[PDB]
Amino acid sequence: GIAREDVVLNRILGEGFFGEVYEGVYTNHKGEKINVAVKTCKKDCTLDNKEKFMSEAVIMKNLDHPHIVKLIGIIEEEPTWIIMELYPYGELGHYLERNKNSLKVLTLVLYSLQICKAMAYLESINCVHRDIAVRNILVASPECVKLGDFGLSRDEVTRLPIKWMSPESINFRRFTTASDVWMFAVCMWEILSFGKQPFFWLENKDVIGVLEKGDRLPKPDLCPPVLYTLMTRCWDYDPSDRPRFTELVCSLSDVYQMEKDIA
Numbered sequence: 001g002i003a004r005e006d007v008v009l010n011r012i013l014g015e016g017f018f019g020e021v022y023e024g025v026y027t028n029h030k031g032e033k034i035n036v037a038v039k040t041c042k043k044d045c046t047l048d049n050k051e052k053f054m055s056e057a058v059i060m061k062n063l064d065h066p067h068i069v070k071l072i073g074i075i076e077e078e079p080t081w082i083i084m085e086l087y088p089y090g091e092l093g094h095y096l097e098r099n100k101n102s103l104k105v106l107t108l109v110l111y112s113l114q115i116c117k118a119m120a121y122l123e124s125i126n127c128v129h130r131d132i133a134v135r136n137i138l139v140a141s142p143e144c145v146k147l148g149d150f151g152l153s154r155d156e157v158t159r160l161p162i163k164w165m166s167p168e169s170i171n172f173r174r175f176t177t178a179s180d181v182w183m184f185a186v187c188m189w190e191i192l193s194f195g196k197q198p199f200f201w202l203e204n205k206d207v208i209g210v211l212e213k214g215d216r217l218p219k220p221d222l223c224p225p226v227l228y229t230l231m232t233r234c235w236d237y238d239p240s241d242r243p244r245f246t247e248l249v250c251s252l253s254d255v256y257q258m259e260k261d262i263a
């Protein structure tokens, strides 16, 4: 559905692979104003690329998870626009950086559990994310985070998020649900560190050497010891020793309940 007259473009959000992404306002039947992200596609693209761009809307319309980004609509007629629901609080990493003096550890464990639930759903359909990081998570409200996949490296030199990747992904470009588990724990380290970048003290080329020797990201200051134990299991060199997301949901819910009881 959705007529173009209902959508007003306001400012450029950023540059996507296929074209610019705009911040906008969608007015529905009730006259309610919904903040939106409007994804565009270059007119001179190949039919194959126009198909790949539109495939996001065809796929995303089937996703209705509370912790996954929401598709509002698609305007098929040229210029073809994909209309995503905008989360004005923005990316979680920047949000954590701004609110570091008021955020409680229970809230950081809550966000980790919400993303784990989103990943447990993707795991159930044998899909891989391959870019799990705090920059791909949006804050719908202080009580709800939403997982997206909108990085310029994208259903599933560098370019690649080396500092978040498993050793099999860095060495052989192997990406499995087990490699997503490794990346997810790197994302949890970013959350518990209030948006710090993993391995900020190294260059990309030093990462593999450090991992092969047995070194790992240190426990963030406010990270509960039991949560850090779970992160280290996700960082096992052997992918078969990493937990599945479905079981990690159970372990994270246990940590959340443990933290709530103390709080």
Ligand SMILES: COc1ccc(-c2cc(NC(=O)Nc3cc(C(C)(C)C)nn3-c3ccc(C)cc3)[nH]n2)c(C)c1
Pocket: 037, 052, 055, 056, 059, 060, 063, 068, 069, 084, 085, 086, 087, 088, 090, 091, 122, 129, 138, 147, 148, 149, 150, 154, 155
């Ligand atoms: C500030 O508020 C904002 C609101 C929304 C956005 C935003 C979201 C997206 N799209 C997106 O996240 N797609 C997605 C998610 C996933 C899983 C389900 C998480 C894996 N898969 N794919 C996917 C991508 C491409 C293809 C072909 C198929 C699927 N673009 N922009 C932004 C930037 C800001």
